[PDB]
Every structure is written in structure tokens, then in C-alpha cells.
Ligand binder design. Structure first.
Ligand SMILES: [Cl-]
Ligand SMILES: [Cl-]
Ligand SMILES: [Cl-]
Ligand SMILES: [Cl-]
Ligand SMILES: [Yb+3]
Ligand SMILES: [Yb+3]
Ligand SMILES: [Yb+3]
Ligand SMILES: [Yb+3]
Lengths: 493, 493, 493, 493
């Protein structure tokens, strides 16, 4: 784990449009904070409807027929993306520090996991650019028919604060690989890494207007994107609540395409025959990773009666081993929550757990004199009606439940409007296949949890999302199919 | 062209749920009319929110893990669909008569085109049932990862009145092939063919609750479908205006998946080098087919200056050759519009053409003492600002425009919020490919128009739709991808 | 199990070319026998090089550009195949009787398994006809590039005697679905079902010359096919020995494409944790099905030491329960071997088992006064060097071996030039996945054996074959890819 | 066009096995020559059957289950290939010089075309590594079935002398991307670039034994590869004559898979309406590129009568503009033929053209006092029976023929056992599509010629080849499909 041997200096704080740095039309700025100290890190230009309009015009112009981005070889789009990955690799130390400092993310994770995933995902996407293909089709009658899988056009992309850099790349990688242009609105909490990446997009040689980055707030800049009459598609990751507003606004405006990656209340099912230590470790990591600030948090763990007490005991032992503090210090194993609103919501939910009669096993309160820290918390004897069993906590709070009937626990696992992911722990082949088939979740892990790679599509069932990101399948939502049918004198097979 | 040698008797008029016939919960009925005579044909049970709720419960139960529809071989779903096609083929005379009588559709077309397309499309879809496949994926790390392309679940399907039988099959064929269950709401104007098909679904042996058909009105039964908290996906074909309401309601309710096939204002571009007679014939058929009541109507025809006068002349000659009347009588070549609302809208638009200074070449008024008939109408010297150049008419009204610059005419062709289809007429290879690439339309025909087959995906760019129907690509919107990732000791390529 | 209530009458005995029945050019005929009685059933026209030449000219003419088979809609090729399946279904009783009588196949199996598989496979293939698609490709430079997946042309298809009807359809179904024309040479032992099917091909309405059937001998008619200068592809199922001659002759003649489905010496690995009764039953059925006359016979069963004695005991109990006799009589559970040569080879191999010191558990000799019957035979304590452990027996002879080390048994399983299939019996998820990955076999069954369906590709590793049949992947070997690259002024994504 | 500013020094001349440099088992060496001067460049170790055996053992060991190459992430195989491309890019000057000096290839072409194509193709292949996917399949019955697209194993790859570096990468790129190990035998005329690349394979960090390079002769080392009992697949590019021997030897040995890219006698058809200057230029470049030493040489140009004289005139003008000499000197536009055998064959064929009565328009003899130079030669009034119209010349010799009937000229174009490529020159959409459909050739160019890219599959019909290289489709011949079918209690869609 190497480190940045010089203090981090912030440089890019302006709106990025047509590969140039712009002040906001209003001239207004907004503060960016460090969640571990509660102090301001810098001021960033506040983009609003006027700044989004400017970005969309730039993206539209870069998408015009005959433009450099439209006419360059698909393989050259791929080359630009591979170059961008090499540049992010070059700036790995500074990006990981910036991510840790701005996002409250453990530095070891930011460096070893987030930045590695960013680079790997970009390289994966670069490889697809010249492999996106349409079809020739044996239509009835004397015609030659083919399809083009064209880019859609201008894509508005709203990035969350939990994995700012990784999610930036999950959105721009496929969009750019397919030949779209983008208007990106990073989270108001975490715009800094995106703006540094914008500097590298310019350096890599992307044509101007292909990527535009407008920092600002959700209700202003985000709503402007979702309601814009000349944005062809919006991609959003965040709360199911905002996802509903995005989908509504797309309908009311211009029927723009929508992909959504939203909340979860993901279940694990631990059968009596499971490797118990493996299940305890993965379920733990599943819920506590990045201070519980993952959509796929394993937030309902159902364990068969006969191993339930042992599971809870081993779980509690594991949860008591954390060292809270500044995420930049080596040996620290839990950072802060992102901000006050999230912090408040987590404490309010923990209070309902206590009140509604869940058994508190450890934690259950705040920590420290500054920073938005929550003690890692475990609740056992949780029942399905409790707030902590129904609502996404997005904090370091583990719920452990008991079951005796597999039919019943699958019904309980599925009894939610969420459906992002699930885990199944068992040594039985038949159970692994049949339970994973029966769970209403977009990703099911068997004897593991939280394994996400560029090669696999990822997305939710039900209210956890619309569409998929990554893998071969995820590229589909960044193309628009055009059928061309040509009259011919005589067709032959 | 054989005919039904006995008078048509109407039999199926009730709500179809769990393969049984139900009265409406309210007990209310609504009238169904013949648009050629303005007389009532029968009374049909009026489904509302209570009847939709009943249908969705039935569809949900038929979709449960372990149910007959979920556990039967994919190849058996295909067999049921091929059986259903054979039954529709058996009842071809009666279905085509019912379609002609109820829908105002020329009988020769209903028999030779609509019913043939219904049967062919069903047979095509039947063939896909056991060919829908997921992937095994070479994920990073020691894991085995695969995907399942599962059915989504309960699909609400809202069918238009213009092609009631064909569009019923375009929706149910793929949905059922993929293993979904469906709640169908046929158009209030045209429920009769759908209910007859329901009788054949029962006869073919589909399990109960797999297909449920609830006749009724858009604002009541349609809104109930779009806003239902346990419908996983809604598919709608109709006006862009209603499409916007559907997408809004999906967002506000349960974030259900939405596919929309909506209006158009589709352009044709006729180059000076085109086979003129071929272009005149296809552009004519393109706009006048089924009394102009096609989403893909070729409603803006741009013709190069030097051949423009000849094109208009030959167009007018062709448009003056129709015989209006009852669509059941042999030799009749134009039937009525579907209803009063459509009729009014068409006459009001024709009035704006005259008023705003378009040149009326033929037609321009109503016809007859009964039935919703409009004279076939041609306007030349149309300009881009006129109501008839901007708004979907959905009537027998042809607009012919002049151009001299190809750059300019592509911009004019694309200058609309619509984007369903387009036509290009030229003998030049380079022009055919480059113009078709530049047009923002889901289907582009070259030297033809209106060629639609089961093998080709069909759908709109921009506000003409979201998603695609038919072809390999159209099956994607009736599946939900689940990724399963299994921990293993050691992976090998 | 219904039966033919009238004595079977043989009708079609001539060469089938251009949908007409031909005598042999020489005028010669050859006898066809019943293997259960050793008596002649009829005389069939003996096709030779002159008759193959005539068939290839017919197939070539039916494949010419502009011919009915080349110009008909892909969907119509599919319709013809679905019609042919309906006709085979209609003649199911007579075909199953003919198969049983001619092939020595148990009637219950012929009716319930072979004929059902024939019909299902044809219906599967029919579904692919209009779903075979090429690609549009984003090539570097200003070009439009697409591919056509064309039929190859005239395909010579050499069918084995073990599953004459099923294998006829495995070859012609995909070939015809893809738009090829075929010259078929059924096994000299079993030409009768193929000729009846030819009568149904004519009845279904296939254009003449699309399917031609030339009965005759391997060294004459088969060699003529393999060495023909105007056959584009040869498909052969049979012994690895003949497969080598076919591949050699394709190289020496016209470099025709070759697919081969050849012998096996397929292993099963039974782990100590396996469901023992399930493993015993599947391994038994795996080796004894159709008198052991299956390429995939489970002819080396490796069982973990601790359950080995119990496995052998339960295996022997199962093998002693057969009733030998005429395959048409209800209750009979083992028919004869196909002919003298196979019969001799089986007895000679059984003699080596005894001689080389394998432990004979049951059987080990001939049965009856007529017909080519072999007692069902089990050998335990078999070692890897014995003839019965190395050579394909193609008879009712089970070999059971012991192992203690999983590493070692995988090496033993793989230590063969064969590689058609394998079985793994275990309750452990990790073992199932890792063992199946490590086995060098085209199909690996887990906790089952011999499960073959139209939807799955099937074929060998190593000397068990070249290429795959059936599934999506199997259709590839019946197309030829043509790339078309068109110069254009300017490409756009 | 930058150049190597230091004299080229040859370094790598030994056999490359397990990432180490080996002398030949015999200790023998063979000379390598410069074809422009006829002088020896160096001595290289002569690999024979003993050296191939050593290479195959190394490749087999690197392919064992549990080895680094088998267990590394697919994405890491891709990374190694992208690294190798970066290294070839770094050594571009030296590789292009070595190619020019050893291969007789014009330096500008070697640098700007060959090396660029090498790098681009490697980068394309790198992108596929983690995108090779199998399927999950909805089989009949209660089973879970999936497929693995595994690497085949040890691939023997025999590279031609005409494009030594490009063809090396066309073979190793896909093979390695798919996870195979390789034993490569470069052409005896041109081993030097391959051995330098081997040095870069070691530097990039490929595991030992994954790539092994054995220089030597065709009849010894090549035959050893083709006949080896433990090589799973052989890929060969070269003469159709040797291709036949390779396919024969694969059949006689171990039924190894064979892909062949062989000769051509490719036709162009120039219609009267074609852009004549464009057609003349592409047809010229098509036949004369790299001294005519391309499999796809446009060696039969059929031109419509009315433009034939003008075409010949303009062709002859173009062919008279070459400057022959050493391919390293700027401004030189034609290098030597590769060796004496090729040189002799070309002069002998040119002599038949004169003798059999073709009209000699220019050239027709040798050039210079040293080097294997042939004057660029044009023959008009060529007829279909002449040796120069039937046999692959593989030299700078253009044949121009006359036609009047399009039906007849397509028959003439197709009347050959070859089928690699073809060109069609016309402005007519219908003709372009229908002629390209009717030509029996693997690649058809329209209004261009010789356009080859990594994204497009390439290969022959008929005796010009078996299989395809490059594009998505070309990756298929470097995988082996394994079906895994798992018994389950109950399947659900
Ligand atoms: Cl498509
Ligand atoms: Cl997928
Ligand atoms: Cl392809
Ligand atoms: Cl597959
Ligand atoms: Yb505080
Ligand atoms: Yb009226
Ligand atoms: Yb005997
Ligand atoms: Yb000389």
C-alpha cells in the first residue's frame, strides 16, 4: 500500500464543457467537505439549469453526423478509453487520496479496490467499442434487411456519492464505448474526483463536448438533466425515492430512456449445512463494507435455527474488532458516514431497532467529537415488520433473523419492493440452484457476497432498478437499434 | 379471397380471467360499434380497477415458482404458441370478418394481411421459446458466474384499435414465449377479436391465469394497469400523449418497466435519381394504408425540385382512384375512420391545411350519410411550420414538400420530436447508406415503405417510443437478467 | 404405449433423387435383415458412385441461385420442417415399428423416446430457420461491412445404424433449416426408416433435389460421398476408425468441410458422498441403453473405494433383471445387437475381460438360438490396461473400477484418445464444478447420465469428434460466412 | 515515414521453448536470405520432429488444469496481449526493417501497413479475452444446463512467408485470447520477425510454454506439427496444395481440428456504370500489392465490353509507373519476389500467357542483375481456359477479361475451385447486393478491394479455406464447447 508522499492540492473546481473550464452562469459556488473532520476542503462552481443547458448543447454538437466523435473508428473510441485508464493508473495515488479525503473512504480500499475497479472496468469497456454489432436478418420477401446498433445520443448521467469514481466509470465507460456523448452530474458531496478525471479526458484527447461535467445539486442540476428536452437518456444511481422522480420527469418531458440503479434490502439465507465461518465472514463484509454505504448491503441475514446462536456469536465477535478514525491513517478499519442527513437517518433507524424490541448485540450509537461516525451495530432477533428489516439503512447496521422453514424464508426474503441482490450459503447443489432461481434479485451470490466484476451485468429486480450495467448485456442500454430494409429484385439465402 | 358464408355471430363479450368468463365487478357494460354504420354491434363487460386487480392476482399466481407455466419445458411454451397459431388459422374467416366489421378494416386486407401477419408472428415467437439463453461469464477471481434470462413476471399490455389482432399478437407472442404472464386491455373501440382469441387460448391449453383479458376504457382500466403496484412491466401502443402518462404513472407507482410504441410523423426523401413510379406507389401506400391509421404513415414526403411536379401529378392520379364504402364489400378500397374523436381531429387538421395556405390537390372533406368517412386528401406546397406538417393526422391525408438541398432536407426530416420510421428513394449506393445512417428513425426503408416482418425489430427513436418489438432484439424487453456467482476453489479457462 | 394394429408392410425401397424413386444404375439390390430373427425383411436398391453422382447433381441444381429453395423465405423453410414433423408424428406407429423391426430396438423406446426425439428435434430446428443472422460490423475506415451466414451448399450426410431415425433428423434438420441441400446415405443395416421419411419429405412439399437419399454400403456409396469433388460438406456419425478415413478423403479430394461424431469410452466418477442409488441407476442406464449401442455409453465407472463394493453389488442386482427377446413384445427389456460383425466384436472383447483377469459378475456369453443376443455383462476389478477398459465395446458390458485419489482418477478418466462425454456423481458444489471443468469431454452430466436434448450442443473432444450438433452452436457448422465490405463516402457510428 | 537510424543487428536465431532459447536437437542450422540481394542474412536453428516434440510437451504442460495460464483471469490474458502490442509498437522501427529486409517488403508498407495491422489486430484480440462466453440453456426436463467455451489446447500454427508478422499475430492473437497454448512454425524463408516477437512475449510476462516458436522447414517441422498425436488443432496459411496434405495428415493421426487459409484466383466484375477511375485503381492495387504475393490478389478482372478498352488503357498506364529496387530505399515502389521457386513459377506462368495467345500489354520478363525481380505485367484478352486465368500466379501479373452478359460473367467468376474473395464495381444498389450474394467468395468488396480489418471475419469458400479468422466469428475456431447438464429437483423459467 504505497501513499502520496506530498500533501494533496485541489486544482479542478470548475464546470467542464467542450474541454474547457467554466464558471457557473450565476457565478455562484458551493462548499465541499471532509466527512471525517466536518471542515471545508474547497469551493466548487455551482451548476444549475443554465449550465446544464450549455453542457447539453456541447454534447449535442459533438454528436452531430460528420463530427469527429461520430466519424472516428470504433477502435479509436476504444483506444481513447484505454488511454484514459492508463492516465487514471498514473494518477492512482492522488485519485485514491482525493476519494478517501472527500468521500470518507478507507484509503487502503480506495487505492486497492476502488481505483483498481475503475481501471479494470474502463479497460473492459474499451474492449467492447469495436465489437458492438448489429444483425443481417432473413426477412420475409425480396428485401435485404440489416440493423445498426447506433449510440443513442446525449446521455445525462447522475453519479452517487458512495463510489464516486467507480460509478463515474460504470456510467461513462459503456456510454463512450458505444459512441454516446455525456453530461455528467457528480454527487454534490463528492464532485472532486470527477473533475480530476475530466482533466484526464482532455489529456487523453477526447473530442470536445464528448464528456461534460457539471457539478451541483440534485434538485437543481439533477432535475434539469432529468427534465431536459434534448437529453436522449438519463442514467441514475441513488435512492429509490429519487429514482421515482427521475422516471416521472422523463415521462413528463421528452420520454427519454431511463436506467436506474437504486436501493436494496438484500437478504442472505444461511442453511444449516453451510460452511459457517465462510458465511459469517461474507455476510459481515456484505453489510459493513464502506460503512454500510452500498446499495447491495446484506441487510437481512436469515440463519437456520440450529446454527443461529453460533452465527450471531461469531458475527458479534467480528463486528467488535473495528478501529474507527480518519480513513487516511494506516490500520484504521472504519471511516465516517458521508454527511449529516445520512448520519441522522442511520441513528434514527438504530433508535427504532432498540424501541421496537430488536436485541442490540453491540454498537448502537455515535462515536467521536467530530466526523459523522457510527459505531458498528448488530441487532439479533429482528422480525420482518421492524423498520430496520424494511428500510434501507445505508449504515453499519447488521440485522440477523431466524428461520426454520425454507419455503417460508424464501417468501420472507422476497417480501420487499427491493430486489437488488441476495446471498445463499449452502453445500447442497440442488439447494444452491433452486434457491438462487427462486430469489427475486438481480445478482445472487452462492457461498460468497458482494462479488462484482466488469464482465457481469448488475442491476435490480422490482424497485431496485430498471436495466443493467456492465457485462455484454449492459451495453444494450447505451445503443439504439435502427432497422434498414432495402428493396431488392431477388433474395437468396 | 374466400369469405364467411354465414352471418357473423358475436359470442365472447365477458372479462377473461383464469380461463373463465367473468362479469364486471360493478356489473356495468359498454357498447361496441361498427364505424362504417355507426350502429351498435354488442355490449361488452366493462372492466375497471377491481377487474384489473382480479386479473393481476390471477397472473401473479400463474407466475409463482413451482406453477405449471414456470415449470413446463420452454419447448412446451413454444408448442402452445404454435397451437394457438393453428387455431387462429382455423378461425381465419371469422376473425378477419370480426376485425373488418369492428375495426372498419378492408376485409381483403384483414384476411390477407392482418390475419396472415398474426399467424406468422405467432409462429415466429413460438420458435424463440426454447432459444432464449443466458451466458457463462469469465469473471475475475475464483468464481463460476452465469446468467439466467428469466421472464419478468406479470406484464400489463394495452393494445391499440388500429391493428387490434396483429398488435395483440405482437405483445402476447414475445411475452408468452419468454415465460411471462399477461393482463391485456384491448382498445375500447375494438375488444371483440381479443376475446375470441382468449377462447382459443383456453382451447390450446394454456394454464389458467397465464393470459387474462380485461376489456374497458383507457382512463379507468388502462390507468389501473399503468399504476398497479404488482404489475412488473407495461407495454403500450398508441398516442405519444398517453405514452407520456403511462411512463409518468410507472415512475409514481412501482417503477415498472415500460415499453412504448407511439406516434410518428415519418418522412420520405425522394431523390431526383429515384425510380419515380416505384416511389410514388410506395409513398402513396405508405400514407393511405388502413385509412392513414398507421403509426408509420409516410406523412411528410420530400421530393427533389426537378421531379416534384411530376411526383405530385402522379400522386394525385393515384389518390383519385379509391372506392369508399363498407369494408366487407368486394372492390371497395377505402373504409371509415375508427370513431368520432379521430374523425373530428382529421377534419380539423385538414381545415388548417386549407387555412394555412397548403395547396389542396384532391379530397379535403367528409363523405357519405353514415360512417366516419374522409375523402382521400392530398396537399402540395406544404411547409414545415404548418399544422399538417407537424402533427400526426392518423387519417388519409398526404403532404408533399419540395427540397433542393440534401443537407437541408435531412435536417428537416429530423426536425421533429417523432422518430418512428422513414423512407429513402434513390438509385445511389452511397446515398442510400449515408442517408439511412443520418435519419433519426427506428426503421428506414430504402426504395420501399411499410415493410414490417416478425424477424425485424421495430420501434421508435425519440418520442416515437421506448424499446423495440419483435426480432431477436425485441425479446430482450420481456426478460429480466439475473446474475449468479458461485464461489469455487479454483477456476480454469 | 399404443401399437400398430396391422402388420407392417414395407413400401419404399428405392433410391430417392429429385423427389422421384430410382432403381440403381447397376440394377443391383442388397438385402436388409431383422437382427432379432436373422431373416431378410426386404431388398433395397444398392446405390454406388453413379447413384451418388446423380444425387449430387440434383442437390447442386436445387442449390443454384434463383432456385425455389434458395429464394423461398427462411420462415417457409421452417414451415416445411414443422410440416415434416407433423407427418412423422402422424406416422409414429409405423415408423417406430419399422425402427424396432429393422434396428433391433425395443419398441417402447422406439415409440416413446426415438420418435419423440425425432419430432421434438425437427420442431426445434424449424424454429431456427428465420433466426440465423449475420452481423453489421464497425470496421476501421469509411466502409459499411456486413456478414451473411449463407448455407454451405450440398451436404453429404452419412447416418449410423444405432439411432437411424433420430440421427437422420439430427443431420437433416439443421442442414435444411440453414438452407442447404443434402445427399443422405443411411446405414446399410438400417435404410428403411430413412426411405419412409423421404416419402414424407415429398408429401410435405420440399422442392425436388433438396433432400436425396441413396441407400447402399459404406466403402462404396459412403466413400463416394466423402471423395466427391462437388460436395461442400460431409457429416458422419460412426466409428472413430471410419471417421479418420472420411477426414483423409476430404483432404485428398476438394477440402470439403467435415463434422464427425465418433466413438467414446466415456467415464463416470462416483464420489463417496454421492446419492448411491441415483448413481447406480444412471450409470446402469448409461451403459446398457439400446444394448450398449450408444457412442456415449458409460463404459468406465470409477467408484470411490469406500462405496465400491456396495456399488458393484447394487449394479449386479440391477443387471440381472433383464428379459431378452424380440423387441416388439411387451415386457421384453433387451433386444439383439445389430449384426454379426458387432456381435463378434462384443464376444471377443468379453473374452479378453475374462482372460486378462477382470472379475466377471454376471453374463459373459451369447443367448438364444437365433438373433444377435448378448447376455448383459458386468466386470468388476477392471484395470486401465485391459482391452475392455480401452476399446469401445458397443455392447451390453459394464466395467466398474476402483479409485482412492481424485487427482489420480481425473487423470485416468482423461487418459484416452476419446472424449465424447462423462458423468460426475457428488453432492458437493465445488467438486461438481471443478471436476466437470477438468474432464476432457464434450458433455459432462452431474448426478445424471445420457441426458440429450435439442437445445444443447453435443459432440466430442479429441478423437470422439470434430464440431458440434444441435443447440445454437451446432447450426454454425451448416453455414458459411461471407463478409461484404462496401466503400462509402463517410461512416458514422 | 521515420526510419531506423542504426544498422539492423540480428540477435534471435534460436528455437524458443518454455521462454528459453534452444539449439536444435540435431545441432543443425539453416541459412536465411535477403531476396533483394540473394545474400545470406544469418543462420537459424533448424527445428525438426525432435524439436517440435519438445515444444508440444512444453505447450501441453502450460495448458494443464491448475497452471498459471489456465487459472489466470481472462482479463489478464487480455492484458498480456495488450502489453505485447505496446512492445511491438515500441520495436516498430526494427520490426519493420527486419520484415522489409527479410521478406522483400517495401519498407513504407512494412512500417505503415504491416506493423500497424499487427498492433491493431493484437489490441482487437486482447479485447475479446474476457468476452468469450458460453450459454445457459432451457433444456427439456428438470436440469440446469450450461456451456463452457473452453480453449481447445495445444494449437500448431504454420505461418506463411508473405506477411510473416501480420499472419503470426492473426494466428497467435485469437489463440491466446481464447486461452490456448501454441507451437508456431514460421516460414523457412522468414523466421526472423517471429523470433524477435518471441523475445517480446517473454518480456511481456507470458507464462513459459504458452508460446513456443520452432523455425525450420515445411516437410520436416510442418509435417511434424500436422501429424503430431498431442496437438489438438493446426492452423495453416499457404498454398492449397499443402493445405490438402495438412488436412490429410490430421485425419491419419489424431483427428486434430484444422483451419486453412489457402490460395485464391479472385475475380473482380466491373459493370459499365462503375466509377471507372476508382475501379482501375482498386483492381490495380488488388493485384499488384506486395509484388502480387497475396492470397486475395485480384487476378481475374472482368470488365463490361463497352468500357473494356478504356479500362485496359488506364490499367496499363498505371502499371508502367513502378520503380523497382531495394525495398528499403525511399521512392522505390516494387520489391523482389520471395525466392527462386516462386520466381521460377511466375516466369513460367508469364511464358504460358504469351504462348497461349494472351495479349501482353507491358512487362513480361525479369529485371536486374540480382534479386528475384519480375517486371509488372499486364495481359489483356485473357480467356478462361488459359493457365494464367486458372492458376494462382502469386506474382505481379494482371489478367483483364471481357464480358457482355452478367449471368455469364457470374458463372465465369464462380467457375473455379478457389473462393477466397471477389470485387464488384457498380453504382447500382440492386446489382451490388445481388451480385455479392451470388459470388462464391468469403469476402466480397463493393467499389473497393483488399480492405481487411480485425473486426471482419476472413476466409475462403471451397478450396480457398476451411474456417474463418478474426472478427467475432473467427474466435469460434479457437474454442471447444463443453456442455454441462446438472440434475435438479425442479426447474423454473
Ligand atoms: Cl438487432
Ligand atoms: Cl447476460
Ligand atoms: Cl459474422
Ligand atoms: Cl453454446
Ligand atoms: Yb457534532
Ligand atoms: Yb353524421
Ligand atoms: Yb447362430
Ligand atoms: Yb540470377
Amino acid at each position: 500500500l504505497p501513499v502520496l508522499l506530498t500533501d494533496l492540492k485541489i486544482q479542478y473546481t470548475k464546470i467542464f464543457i467542450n474541454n474547457e473550464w467554466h464558471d457557473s452562469v450565476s457565478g455562484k459556488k458551493f462548499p465541499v467537505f471532509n466527512p471525517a473532520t466536518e471542515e471545508e476542503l474547497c469551493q466548487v462552481e455551482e451548476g444549475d439549469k443554465e449550465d446544464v443547458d450549455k453542457a447539453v448543447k456541447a454534447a449535442r454538437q459533438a454528436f452531430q453526423i460528420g463530427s469527429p466523435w461520430r466519424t472516428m473508428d470504433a477502435s479509436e473510441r476504444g483506444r481513447l478509453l484505454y488511454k484514459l485508464a492508463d492516465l487514471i493508473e498514473r494518477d492512482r495515488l492522488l485519485l485514491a487520496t482525493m476519494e478517501s479525503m472527500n468521500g470518507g473512504k478507507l484509503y487502503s480500499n480506495a487505492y486497492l479496490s476502488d481505483l483498481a475497479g475503475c481501471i479494470k472496468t474502463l479497460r473492459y469497456c474499451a474492449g467492447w467499442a469495436d465489437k458492438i454489432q448489429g444483425r443481417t436478418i432473413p426477412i420475409d420477401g425480396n428485401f435485404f434487411t440489416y440493423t445498426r446498433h447506433e449510440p443513442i445520443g446525449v446521455c445525462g448521467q447522475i453519479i452517487p456519492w458512495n463510489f464516486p469514481l467507480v460509478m463515474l466509470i460504470w456510467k461513462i465507460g459503456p456510454a463512450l464505448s458505444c459512441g454516446n456523448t455525456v453530461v455528467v452530474k457528480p454527487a454534490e458531496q463528492t464532485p472532486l474526483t470527477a473533475l480530476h478525471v475530466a482533466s484526464l479526458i482532455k489529456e487523453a484527447g477526447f473530442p470536445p463536448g464528448v464528456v461534460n461535467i457539471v457539478p451541483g445539486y440534485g434538485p437543481t442540476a439533477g432535475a434539469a438533466i432529468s427534465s431536459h428536452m434534448d437529453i436522449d437518456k438519463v442514467a441514475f444511481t441513488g435512492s429509490t425515492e429519487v429514482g421515482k422522480l427521475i422516471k416521472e420527469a422523463a415521462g413528463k418531458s421528452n420520454l427519454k430512456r431511463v436506467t436506474l440503479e437504486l436501493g436494496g434490502k438484500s437478504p442472505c439465507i444461511v442453511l444449516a449445512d453451510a460452511d459457517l465461518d465462510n458465511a459469517v465472514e461474507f455476510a459481515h463484509h456484505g453489510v459493513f463494507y464502506h460503512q454500510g454505504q452500498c446499495c447491495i448491503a446484506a441487510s437481512r441475514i436469515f440463519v437456520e435455527e440450529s446454527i443461529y446462536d453460533e452465527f450471531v456469536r461469531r458475527s458479534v465477535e467480528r463486528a467488535k474488532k473495528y478501529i474507527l478514525g480518519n480513513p487516511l491513517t494506516p490500520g484504521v478499519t472504519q471511516g465516517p458516514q458521508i454527511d449529516k442527513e445520512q448520519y441522522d437517518k442511520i441513528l434514527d433507524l438504530i433508535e427504532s431497532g432498540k424501541k421496537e424490541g430488536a436485541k442490540l448485540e453491540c454498537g448502537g450509537g455515535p462515536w467521536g467529537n467530530k466526523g459523522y461516525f457510527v459505531q458498528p451495530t448488530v441487532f439479533s432477533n429482528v422480525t420482518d415488520e421492524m423498520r430496520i428489516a424494511k428500510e434501507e439503512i445505508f449504515g453499519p447496521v447488521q440485522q440477523i433473523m431466524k428461520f426454520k422453514s425454507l419455503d417460508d424464508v424464501i417468501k420472507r426474503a422476497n417480501n420487499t419492493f427491493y430486489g437488488l441482490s441476495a446471498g445463499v450459503f449452502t453445500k447442497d447443489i440442488d439447494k444452491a440452484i433452486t434457491i438462487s432461481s427462486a430469489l427475486q434479485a438481480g445478482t445472487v451470490w452462492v457461498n460468497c457476497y458482494g462479488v462484482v466484476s466488469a464482465q457481469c451485468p448488475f442491476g435490480g429486480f422490482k424497485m431496485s432498478g430498471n436495466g443493467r450495467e456492465l457485462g455484454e448485456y449492459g451495453f444494450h442500454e447505451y445503443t439504439e437499434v435502427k432497422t434498414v430494409t432495402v428493396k431488392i429484385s431477388q433474395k437468396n439465402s
